[PDB]
Amino acid sequence: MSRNVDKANSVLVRFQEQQAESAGGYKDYSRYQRPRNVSKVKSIKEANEWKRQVSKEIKQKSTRIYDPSLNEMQIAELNDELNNLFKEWKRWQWHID
Amino acid sequence: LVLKSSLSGDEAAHKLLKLKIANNLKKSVVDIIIKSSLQESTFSKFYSILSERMITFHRSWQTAYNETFEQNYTQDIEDYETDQLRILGKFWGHLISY
C-alpha cells in the first residue's frame, strides 16, 4: 500500500470511518463521490455538505483554468466541466427547503 | 562422522577416546576405521596417525588392532578389490614400520 491512497482505502481505515459515521456522525464528504440524482437525500445536512463539496470543486476548477498555456485543450475541456459543476450546484439549490 | 569431522588424525583419535567405548567395541571401532580408510581413494597418513594415537593410548586398543589385523590377512583380505587392498597394506606397513 505504498503512495498513501492504498493506506487510506485500507480495510482498517474504512472500518474506522464506518464506526465514526455510526457513532457521532463523522462523515467525510470529500471521501465519497457526490451522488448523481438528487432527491435521494432526505436529510438537509447531507445535502448542504454535498453542495459545499461541489462549490469547492468548482473553485478548484476555476483556479486552474486561468493558467498561462491557455491554448491547450485541457483548459477548453474544463470550461465544459466548469459549466457542468455550475449546473450541479444549481440543482443542489433545489426548493424543497 | 567422527573420522570425517576432524582435520588431523590426532583430532579424530581424541574424539574417539572421548567416547570411551567399552573394551568389547574397540575391535568394532577399529574395523570401522579400516573400512573408512579403504573407502578413501588412496592411503592417507591421517588414518595411520589416528591408529598410532589409539595404540599409544592403551593396551586394549593395541589388542583390538592386533585382532583386526588377524581378521584381515586370514578372512577379510580376499574380499577387497585391488586398490583398496593396496591401501590397506600401506596402512598396515605404516603401523608396523614403528
Binding site: 503512495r3 491512497v5 482505502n9 482498517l12 474504512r14 472500518f15 470529500s30 471521501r31 498555456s69 | -
Partner: protein
C-alpha cells in the same frame, strides 16, 4: 509506529468478516478504489518524443504515471496495460501499452519512438 510493525491495533469489537463486509458496502460509494488510472512510478523504456512540444524524453527517465487496465487482453489470460506519462515542458498526456507478443511496448497516441 515503525515500518516493520508486526500487529496493528484493532478495537475490542472487530468482527473481521463483518468489517470486511462493511468496507465492501462502503467501497462502491468510495471515491478512490472505485476509479481507473491508479498512479504508478515508472521509468520510460521507449525513449521517445512528446508529439506536441517535441521534448525528447530519453530512456530510463522517471515519471509518476497512471497505470490503467486495458479490457481487451492479449490472447486470453495475460493482461496488458496503458501507462500514462506527461511531457516535462508541455502537459500532453503521452502513454503506451505493453503488448507481450514481442516482449516490448506499443505507443498509444502520445509520442513516437526513436
Amino acid at each position: 509506529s515503525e515500518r516493520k510493525a508486526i500487529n496493528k491495533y484493532y478495537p475490542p469489537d472487530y468482527n473481521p468478516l463483518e468489517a470486511e463486509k462493511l468496507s465492501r458496502k462502503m467501497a462502491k460509494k468510495l471515491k478512490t478504489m472505485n476509479k481507473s488510472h491508479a498512479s504508478i512510478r515508472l521509468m520510460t523504456p521507449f525513449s521517445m518524443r512528446c508529439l506536441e512540444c517535441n521534448e525528447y524524453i530519453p530512456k530510463s527517465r522517471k515519471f509518476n504515471g497512471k497505470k490503467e487496465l486495458l479490457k481487451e487482453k492479449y490472447l486470453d489470460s495475460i493482461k496488458i496495460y496503458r501507462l500514462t506519462i506527461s511531457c516535462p515542458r508541455c502537459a500532453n498526456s503521452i502513454a503506451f501499452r505493453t503488448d507481450p507478443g514481442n516482449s516490448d511496448y506499443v505507443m498509444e497516441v502520445g509520442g513516437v519512438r526513436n
